[PDB]
Amino acid sequence: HMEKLAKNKVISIDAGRKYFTLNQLKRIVDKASELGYSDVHLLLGNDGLRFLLDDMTITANGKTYASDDVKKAIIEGTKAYYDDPNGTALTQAEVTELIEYAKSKDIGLIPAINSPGHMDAMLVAMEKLGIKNPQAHFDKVSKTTMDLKNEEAMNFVKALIGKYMDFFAGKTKIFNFGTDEYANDATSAQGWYYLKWYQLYGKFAEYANTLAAMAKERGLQPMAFNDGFYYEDKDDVQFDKDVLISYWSKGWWGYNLASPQYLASKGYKFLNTNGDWYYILGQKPEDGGGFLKKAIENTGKTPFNQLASTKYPEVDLPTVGSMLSIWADRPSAEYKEEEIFELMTAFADHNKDYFRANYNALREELAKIKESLEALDAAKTALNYNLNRNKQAELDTLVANLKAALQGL
Ligand SMILES: [Mg+2]
Ligand SMILES: [Mg+2]
Ligand SMILES: [Mg+2]
Ligand SMILES: [Mg+2]
Numbered sequence: 483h484m485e486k487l488a489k490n491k492v493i494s495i496d497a498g499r500k501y502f503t504l505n506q507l508k509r510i511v512d513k514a515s516e517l518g519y520s521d522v523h524l525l526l527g528n529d530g531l532r533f534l535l536d537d538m539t540i541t542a543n544g545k546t547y548a549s550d551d552v553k554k555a556i557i558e559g560t561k562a563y564y565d566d567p568n569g570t571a572l573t574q575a576e577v578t579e580l581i582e583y584a585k586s587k588d589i590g591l592i593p594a595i596n597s598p599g600h601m602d603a604m605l606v607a608m609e610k611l612g613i614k615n616p617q618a619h620f621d622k623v624s625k626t627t628m629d630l631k632n633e634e635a636m637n638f639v640k641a642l643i644g645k646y647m648d649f650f651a652g653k654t655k656i657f658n659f660g661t662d663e664y665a666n667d668a669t670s671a672q673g674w675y676y677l678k679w680y681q682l683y684g685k686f687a688e689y690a691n692t693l694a695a696m697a698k699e700r701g702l703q704p705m706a707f708n709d710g711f712y713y714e715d716k717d718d719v720q721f722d723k724d725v726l727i728s729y730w731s732k733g734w735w736g737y738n739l740a741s742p743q744y745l746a747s748k749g750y751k752f753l754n755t756n757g758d759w760y761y762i763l764g765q766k767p768e769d770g771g772g773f774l775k776k777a778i779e780n781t782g783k784t785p786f787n788q789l790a791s792t793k794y795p796e797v798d799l800p801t802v803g804s805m806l807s808i809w810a811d812r813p814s815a816e817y818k819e820e821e822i823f824e825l826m827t828a829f830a831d832h833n834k835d836y837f838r839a840n841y842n843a844l845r846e847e848l849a850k851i852k853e854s855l856e857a858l859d860a861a862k863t864a865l866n867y868n869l870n871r872n873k874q875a876e877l878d879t880l881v882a883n884l885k886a887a888l889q890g891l
């Protein structure tokens with residue numbers, strides 16, 4: 483059916499907290515293409531900022547920050563969060579190659595540059611560039627979140643995100659600006675309650691609305707996590723309606739995030755990023771949370787269309803697709819490719835009607851191209867590009883016929 487295959491099947495990789503090589507990411511892309519995924523969600527800004535453009539010149543606050551100054555500041559900020567021995571940041575040439583490599587396998591890339599929360603690297607970077615006190619300050623000075631009242635910091639980050647958006651414009655369909663937290667380290671995980679207390683929640687919305695307008699103007703579909711949108715189902719503060727919502731959870735006790743029902747009533751489309759499918763690198767059964775055993779179990783237990791805090795199909799809210807997420811909460815933990823591959827395969831195997839068939843063997847065979855020309859032409863026409871994961875044997879036969887016609891030219 484066209485509807486199921488039209489939906490997004492996304493694997494999310496936390497390459498913000500932890501470094502991934504181009505080859506590691508290429509191998510994730512190829513495995514995603516094999517299993518029938520449509521997109522790779524790649525966090526590049528998440529705590530650490532692990533992506534540098536060739537030109538990092540920034541214009542904000544009536545002055546310009548030299549490209550080499552910005553690069554050096556960001557590298558110092560990212561190493562300040564976590565000095566990864568595997569590497570610090572991906573280059574423009576590496577990300578450009580990754581986008582083109584993914585495109586050749588019908589895989590989209592969804593970049594994520596997080597703010598105002600989860601931006602440890604940007605905060606230190608701004609300090610090195612002469613921007614004093616960029617951090618939010620509540621129970622203590624945050625190490626993760628920008629102060630919304632600091633114009634100097636706000637103007638720089640907007641300009642910085644703009645430059646990242648300029649690069650992804652015309653290369654990717656979607657840009658994720660995050661907005662998933664506000665100084666949870668400085669509020670005992672009560673960032674939204676603190677924004678409300680200090681009447682700065684209107685200022686948060688203004689920042690999120692700006693980022694959404696920045697994405698749309700540059701031809702990018704705006705994307706954000708649900709956390710900041712219409713907190714506690716209240717609408718005295720309005721948000722941009724065009725944002726694709728990465729819904730992952732309704733929160734916990736004292737963390738009253740908007741329900742999927744309420745956000746759906748505002749007209750929001752969801753990318754189902756259910757927290758049930760979460761795997762944090764190195765997480766074990768005794769730690770609780772997103773360990774590998776539970777994540778693999780949940781790919782079967784939690785329905786593809788089930789939004790967090792809802793029972794499916796009882797509550798059936800329209801989604802554009804689903805996203806399984808890999809996190810690197812402690813980036814020092816070892817990335818084991820096969821663990822991610824097993825979790826990716828499990829999600830595809832439980833949902834064979836949503837995921838497409840493996841078209842890698844078919845692409846290899848087409849790269850190798852007078853009753854002989856009639857036979858080759860007939861097998862080429864017989865090819866079916868619309869087969870899901872349930873029909874691999876059906877596709878394999880069609881590829882085998884193309885092989886027989888090609889070996890008899
Ligand atoms: Mg302090
Ligand atoms: Mg307010
Ligand atoms: Mg739009
Ligand atoms: Mg998920």
Ligand SMILES: [Mg+2]
Pocket residue numbers: 568815816817
């Ligand atoms: Mg490692």
